[PDB]
Design a protein around this ligand. Structure first.
Ligand SMILES: COc1ccc(NC(=O)Nc2ccncc2)cc1
Length: 281
């Protein structure tokens, strides 16, 4: 049981040690498409690349590349697209991916500016009457409504394919209170946020996979998926305590490198799952 494993690692302060064991056990697959010179300006960080086998392909003949990975958790019947915060030149690619994959939700776990630097392009409209057109991908995006709470904002967006005049409603879930350094003290507001995404139907198999991002799409994004999948598996299994976070994390790392960036994010993931288990038992 993970609650006892938590106290052990915590009392022994062995978080950096377990984290290193995970780093060394993690899969390594080719990422040849990401490293092509023509894709250099489509990557925010040169050391964060999608594996070729799990990368999302854009349906454009010219260049199909986006820094995005499909995480498929077979036992949990959950699938997530993890991607980097879009760049100024990839905002149109981002919304093309949302369109092509039939996603219903976008989950954003960063602020546009953190530590005085831009972590992400402003890829959604700030006002109802000022819609955005992505000329490169032939899409129009309109803010329909915005509901600002203390810890997160939910926005309803309309995405229109200008080529076919189909429209879809997209839900933007923006967690706004992750601190510049370290992790939240308590996982309560993060769990509340995760349950709000679930309640929307954005994580449901009727829809394409949810798009999850932070700046690189590996750290905070990793914590989001890890907590969701672990809590799901605890509902599904005859023995909820057979769920080993470490094993679940290593499975996800077959699909995208580097998920959970720090020993602090690992500790926070344990705490989120342990605490979330009380609201589920
Ligand atoms: C000398 O380099 C090494 C660094 C780390 C490990 N693994 C390790 O400490 N695992 C561990 C698991 C649970 N509690 C405490 C520790 C082995 C060798």
């Amino acid at each position: 049981e993970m609650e006892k494993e938590f106290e052990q690692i915590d009392k022994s302060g062995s978080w950096a040690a377990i984290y290193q064991d995970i780093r060394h056990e993690a899969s390594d697959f080719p990422s040849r498409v990401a490293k092509l010179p023509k894709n250099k300006n489509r990557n925010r960080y040169r050391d964060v690349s999608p594996f070729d086998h799990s990368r999302i392909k854009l349906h454009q003949e010219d260049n199909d590349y986006i820094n995005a990975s499909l995480i498929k958790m077979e036992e949990a019947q959950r699938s997530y697209i993890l991607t980097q915060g879009p760049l100024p030149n990839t905002v149109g690619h981002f919304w093309e991916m949302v369109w092509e994959q039939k996603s219903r939700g976008v989950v954003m776990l960063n602020r546009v500016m953190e530590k005085g630097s831009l972590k992400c392009a402003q890829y959604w409209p700030q006002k109802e009457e000022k819609e955005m057109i992505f000329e490169d991908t032939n899409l129009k995006l309109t803010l329909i409504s915005e509901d600002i709470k203390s810890y997160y904002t939910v926005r309803q967006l309309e995405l229109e394919n200008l080529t076919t005049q189909e429209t879809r409603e997209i839900l933007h879930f923006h967690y706004t209170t992750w601190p510049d350094f370290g992790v939240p003290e308590s996982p309560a507001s993060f769990l509340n946020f995760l349950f709000k995404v679930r309640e929307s139907g954005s994580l449901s198999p009727e829809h394409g996979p949810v798009v999850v991002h932070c700046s690189a799409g590996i750290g905070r994004s990793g914590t989001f998926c890890l907590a969701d999948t672990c809590l799901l598996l605890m509902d599904k299994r005859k023995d909820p305590s057979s769920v080993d976070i470490k094993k679940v994390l290593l499975e996800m790392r077959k699909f995208r490198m580097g998920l959970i960036q720090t020993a602090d994010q690992l500790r926070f993931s344990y705490l989120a799952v342990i605490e979330g288990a009380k609201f589920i038992m």
